[PDB]
């Protein structure tokens, strides 16, 4: 017959390969495909939706709704209010939509949107500095050290939300999802720019945060997720 | 995938088959091919060269140069001088170039050239009858029984050699190399036609013989040669 050869990798079952397979049940006509609203073709479109960062994950607030906001007040001196380390393996990001999509992939490359919303009354105003320290830089611990990075300064009035675009600043072309020191993403820090001034002396505001992906965000090397375990058998 | 079948004779290693094989050492550039004189493309061209028949293979002369000639003399009556049985398995033919080529092949078909040369002085003359008895005929033992076959009569003077073309006379289309009684080739016999007359009374001549293939000679069924043995291990 026709001379053939079976090189290495012929009688192997790779799971992630693409092969054709003999149709069991031939002549089977499937049920018809109707227009169901909301069809998703790419899981990055799930990753691009704003999803709340659990910015108050401390050991009392986890398991409660009050882990999604921090409480701000009128202070005299500028304090660092909140630090989000730009890691997709950190539990701040990895429990969101963006992070639980990006935790399936070993690498990621793109820009992050982080949108802060202050829930307070209509008379509380305030200015906050939201700074992104690029990779290789220390966590600032001073506003003069934080304003030297990628920052925005947002006022409070008539709209509660403001978005900092954490840009893609990296040496390599892709950043690792499980954060190491070689490809660390940097830090996002929230500061008081001028204060938070409520209409009373002991008044408060509640700052939330959401994160999503920019359109230029890409992922590769699909892997297992560390955001799923199985220790017992599901029966 | 594409439906294939592996019939019988697929996973077999036949030695005489013709297959392609993966080149070990890829990118290897061989050394260049220069014009070397004498290139041989067909071993029949070796078989077509005149090569001396050991016509005196008797138990004293083998192992010596004097097995290639017989000695003739002045006789009164006609004597049968020499008989070559037309067998390619006979040690007369099988040790020549023609015979050691044709002993590799189980069958052969064609005509034989046999050239007799008389080495004597320039005054010795003689006439010899060289007869080829066709297959099925007895060995003649009389010149009147030998002249009824394919014969030539050659005189001696100014050139010492004469060729008898043993023609292809056979029932079948091919003759077996290992001679049997069904496909025997016949006999070639050398006779005195008139004498051998030397310039002295006890003078002698030395008749040699060479054999080769005619252009219409063919072989088939390449086999082992019986002209090679191996009893010890070559180390």
């Amino acid at each position: 017959g026709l001379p053939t050869r079976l090189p290495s990798g012929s009688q192997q079952f790779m799971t992630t390969e693409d092969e054709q397979s003999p149709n069991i049940l031939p002549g089977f006509h499937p049920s018809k495909k109707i227009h169901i609203p909301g069809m998703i073709t790419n899981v990055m479109h799930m990753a691009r939706v704003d999803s709340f960062i659990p910015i108050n994950n401390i050991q009392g607030e986890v398991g409660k709704v009050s882990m999604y906001y921090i409480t701000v007040t009128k202070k005299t001196v500028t304090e660092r209010i909140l630090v989000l380390p730009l890691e997709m393996s950190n539990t701040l990001f990895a429990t969101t939509l963006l992070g639980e999509v990006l935790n399936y992939y070993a690498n990621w490359s793109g820009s992050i949107t982080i949108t802060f919303m202050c829930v307070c009354d209509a008379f509380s105003t305030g200015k906050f500095l939201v700074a992104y320290t690029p990779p290789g830089g220390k966590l600032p611990e001073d506003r003069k050290q934080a304003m030297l990075g990628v920052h925005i300064i947002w006022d409070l009035g008539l709209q509660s939300s403001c978005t900092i675009v954490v840009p893609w600043i990296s040496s390599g072309f892709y950043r690792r999802t499980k954060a190491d020191s070689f490809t660390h993403g940097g830090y996002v820090s929230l500061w008081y720019q001028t204060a938070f001034v409520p209409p009373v002396s002991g008044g408060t505001g509640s700052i939330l945060a959401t994160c999503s992906a920019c359109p230029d965000m890409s992922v590769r090397m699909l892997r297992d997720s560390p955001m799923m375990e199985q220790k017992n058998e599901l029966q | 995938g594409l439906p294939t079948r592996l019939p019988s004779g697929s996973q077999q290693f036949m030695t005489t088959e013709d297959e392609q094989s993966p080149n070990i050492l890829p990118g290897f550039h061989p050394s260049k091919k220069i014009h070397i004189p004498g290139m041989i493309t067909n071993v029949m061209h070796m078989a077509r060269v005149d090569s001396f028949i050991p016509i005196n293979n008797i138990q004293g002369e083998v192992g010596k140069v004097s097995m290639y000639y017989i000695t003739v003399t002045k006789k009164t009556v006609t004597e049968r001088i020499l008989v070559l049985p037309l067998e390619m398995s006979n040690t007369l033919f099988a040790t020549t170039l023609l015979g050691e080529v044709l002993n590799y092949y189980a069958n052969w078909s064609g005509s034989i050239t046999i050239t007799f040369m008389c080495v004597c002085d320039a005054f010795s003359t003689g006439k010899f009858l060289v007869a080829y008895t066709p297959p099925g005929g007895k060995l003649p033992e009389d010149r009147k029984q030998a002249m009824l076959g394919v014969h030539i009569i050659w005189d001696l003077g100014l050139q010492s050699s004469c060729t008898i073309v043993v023609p292809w006379i056979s029932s079948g289309f091919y003759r077996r190399t290992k001679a049997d009684s069904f496909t025997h080739g016949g006999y070639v016999s050398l006779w005195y036609q008139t004498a051998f007359v030397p310039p002295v009374s006890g003078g002698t001549g030395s008749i040699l013989a060479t054999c080769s293939a005619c252009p219409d000679m063919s072989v088939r069924m390449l086999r082992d040669s019986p002209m090679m043995e191996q009893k010890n291990e070559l180390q």
Binding site: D18, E19, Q20, S21, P22, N23, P26, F28, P30, P37, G38, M39, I40, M44, H45, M46, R48, V49, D50, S212 | G1, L2, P3
Partner: peptide, 25 residues
Amino acid sequence: NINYYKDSASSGLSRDPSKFTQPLV
């Protein structure tokens, strides 16, 4: 691109964000 089994289910793997991220009127 050959279909070795002459069936649509027997093949290999086959091949807009704005319904999410902006579902406004």
